[PDB]
């Protein structure tokens, strides 16, 4: 199984909006840098800050070609506390379903807007994060394969490394499912892992 | 704190690499990737003397090998070390 270019484009647009929303609802950055916009016929908050925007843009631009060949199991937005321990994780787990489902492309907005709505109200079910949190994004490949690095390593200015245990391990995690969707060609699931005392 | 598969001491890394490139003619990608990682950890730990040694060592063995595969392996590892140096230090390693 492989996705296509456009499915991968769809997913990257989706993830850009999402990452912005997360950084907003979890006050990783202060509200003063955001502006109301509208994606998938619904209200979101997009950062205005050019450096931050370029970071998120760069990140996803690099993931794109691995989505193309369906080589990504998870994209993870990790929130790190002041001492750089992970406090919280937003996981987009991406599967290929093996036909009576909805068409992904015909129904894009209904299908993805559901994720966005859930991110908007998610602080209702998460514990507040401490002050000082930063973020990082992590890509979990299906395989440990050379080609993932070739494909990811497309902006000289914006290189990638393999992560360690430090970047990943969360103590005593609790799980909060947010949204699960199946389609034509794609099964995606968004769920949060938070630390049990933050 | 930077290790190849447990090998911390420079020479354990040396022997482990040597045996590895000298025994195997089709290396597991998963291993190649650990080498890259090991090298980028050397950069994050500020041990530039060691990566230069390692780089050179595996350049010599990898490129000396008859296998097309080790030659390509080296190229991959070095590429991925270079983009990281070029951003951590503003420079790429000198390779003659």
């Amino acid at each position: 199984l492989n996705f296509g270019q456009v499915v991968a484009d769809v997913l990257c647009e989706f993830l850009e909006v999402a990452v912005h929303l997360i950084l907003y609802v979890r006050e990783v950055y202060p509200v003063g840098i955001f502006q109301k916009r509208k994606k998938y016929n619904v209200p979101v908050q997009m950062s205005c800050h050019p450096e931050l925007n370029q970071y998120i843009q760069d990140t996803l631009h690099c993931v794109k070609p691995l989505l193309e060949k369906n080589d990504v199991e998870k994209v993870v937005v990790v929130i790190l506390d002041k001492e750089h321990r992970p406090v919280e994780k937003f996981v987009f787990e991406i599967t290929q379903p093996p036909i009576s489902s909805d068409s992904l492309l015909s129904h894009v907005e209904q299908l993805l807007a559901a994720f966005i709505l859930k991110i908007s109200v998610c602080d209702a079910v998460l514990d507040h994060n401490p002050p000082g949190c930063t973020f990082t994004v992590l890509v979990h490949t299906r395989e440990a394969a050379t080609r993932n690095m070739e494909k990811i390593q497309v902006i000289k200015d914006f290189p990638w490394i393999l992560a360690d245990e430090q970047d990943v391990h969360m103590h005593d995690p609790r799980l909060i499912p947010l949204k699960t969707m199946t389609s034509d060609i794609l099964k995606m699931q968004l769920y949060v892992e938070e630390r049990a005392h933050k | 704190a930077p290790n190849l598969a447990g090998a911390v001491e420079f020479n354990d890394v040396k022997t482990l690499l040597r045996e590895w490139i000298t025994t195997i003619s089709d290396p597991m990608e998963e291993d190649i990737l650990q080498v890259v990682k090991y090298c980028t950890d050397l950069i994050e730990e500020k041990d530039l003397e060691k990566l230069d040694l390692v780089i050179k060592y595996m350049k010599r063995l990898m490129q000396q090998s008859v296998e097309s595969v080790w030659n390509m392996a080296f190229d991959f590892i070095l590429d991925n070390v270079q983009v990281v140096l070029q951003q951590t230090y503003g420079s790429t390693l000198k390779v003659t």
């Binding site: 990783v28 950055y29 450096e51 990082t136 992590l138 394969a145 490394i161 992560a163 970047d167 | 951003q87």
Partner: peptide, 20 residues
């Protein structure tokens, strides 16, 4: 592990933003 990739760069911090 061997199948997790992450950007070398940190995103711009909260501080670094307070002034732009």
């Amino acid at each position: 592990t061997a199948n997790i990739l992450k950007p070398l760069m940190s995103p711009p911090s909260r501080e670094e933003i307070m002034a732009t």
